[PDB]
């Protein structure tokens, strides 16, 4: 067991950290008040959206190419063709919006409810609801959801869970693989995922009043402190 202590990573940010080794009965929580509060998921919803898109056949696989529509969006990297997988890695919102429209409201409602995704409220609009909008999920609920993804107990086909996990690989090291996804917007900063280290796996969520980049940095620093992630040698 790890005697977590993380106060030093939250001196300048209001935030919460939730982490659970998969055999543990309950997560360890820093800032339990915020950990139970629901927040717009921002692009962390891409994890769920990808599962749903694959399950419904809205997209074929991680290599399903969608063509750029020629509309110049504010992030240059968006203004080119993308796949389901590149769209997760680069958080290409328009790709996932197009997929959501194909999934459609009826199927999206069903699946968001089936996976206990926070308040399950998609009424903000089929291509809007996860972006500073109606859908909100707590850090504790992100960990419950991601634990089921890791353990492959969600009501999706195994193949689709395996595909989405491959798309979530963020860091590959000799003795660990970190899986995760950022989210940011409206002063909500997320990093959610799981790290496999040797024969242990830790499911985690970081949520701050700040940005996703900041949340990811805090996460890496915590994982390094406890030797789950290698130092920058």
d(CA 207, CA 189): 5
Residue 134 class from Cβ within 10 Å (0-12 exposed, 13-18 middle, 19+ buried)?
Answer: middle
* Resolution (Å) of this entry: 1.0
135 contacts 127 by C-beta, under 8 angstroms: no
* CATH classification of the domain holding 3: 3.40.710.10
d(CA 130, CA 42): 5
Q: How many domains does the chain have?
A: 1
Tell me, yes or no, if 5 is annotated catalytic: no
43 secondary structure, DSSP code: G
Assigned token pair, 188: 């909500």
Way it was determined: X-ray
Domain that holds residue 216: 1-233
Q: Which of 5, 26, 43, 186 is catalytic?
A: 43
d(CA 51, CA 203): 18
Q: Which long-range contacts (CB under 8 A, 24 or more apart) does 212-216 make?
A: 212/42, 212/43, 212/182, 212/183, 212/184, 213/182, 213/184, 213/189, 214/13, 214/189, 215/15, 215/182, 215/184, 215/189, 215/190, 215/191, 216/180, 216/182, 216/191
192 contacts 35 by C-beta, under 8 angstroms: no
Helix (H) or strand (E) holding 191: strand 188-197
d(CA 215, CA 16): 10
Q: Which residue has 């995704």 as its token pair?
A: 117
Length of the chain: 233
Residue 21 class from Cβ within 10 Å (0-12 exposed, 13-18 middle, 19+ buried)?
Answer: middle
């Amino acid at each position: 067991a790890i005697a977590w202590s993380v106060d030093e990573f939250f001196k300048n940010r209001e935030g919460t950290f939730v982490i659970q080794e998969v055999k543990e009965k309950s997560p360890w929580v820093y800032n339990k008040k915020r950990a139970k509060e629901r927040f717009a998921p921002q692009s962390t919803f891409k994890v769920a959206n990808a599962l749903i898109g694959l399950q419904t056949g809205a997209v074929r696989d991680e290599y399903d190419i969608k063509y750029w529509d020629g509309v110049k969006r504010e992030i240059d990297n968006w203004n080119r063709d993308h796949t389901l997988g590149s769209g997760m890695r680069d958080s290409v919102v328009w790709y996932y919006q197009a997929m959501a429209r194909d999934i459609g409201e009826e199927r999206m409602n069903h699946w968001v409810k089936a996976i206990h995704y926070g308040n399950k409220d998609i009424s903000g609009g089929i291509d809007q609801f996860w972006l500073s909008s109606t859908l909100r999920i707590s850090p504790i609920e992100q960990v419950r959801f991601l634990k089921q993804l890791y353990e492959e107990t969600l009501p999706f086909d195994l193949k689709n869970m395996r595909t989405v996990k491959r798309m979530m690989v963020q860091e590959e090291e000799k003795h660990a693989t970190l899986y995760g996804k950022t989210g940011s917007g409206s002063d909500i900063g997320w990093y959610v995922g799981f790290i496999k280290h040797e024969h242990k796996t830790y499911i985690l969520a970081t949520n701050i009043k700040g940005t996703g980049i900041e949340a990811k940095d805090i996460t890496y620093r915590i994982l390094k402190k406890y030797h789950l992630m290698e130092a920058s040698v």
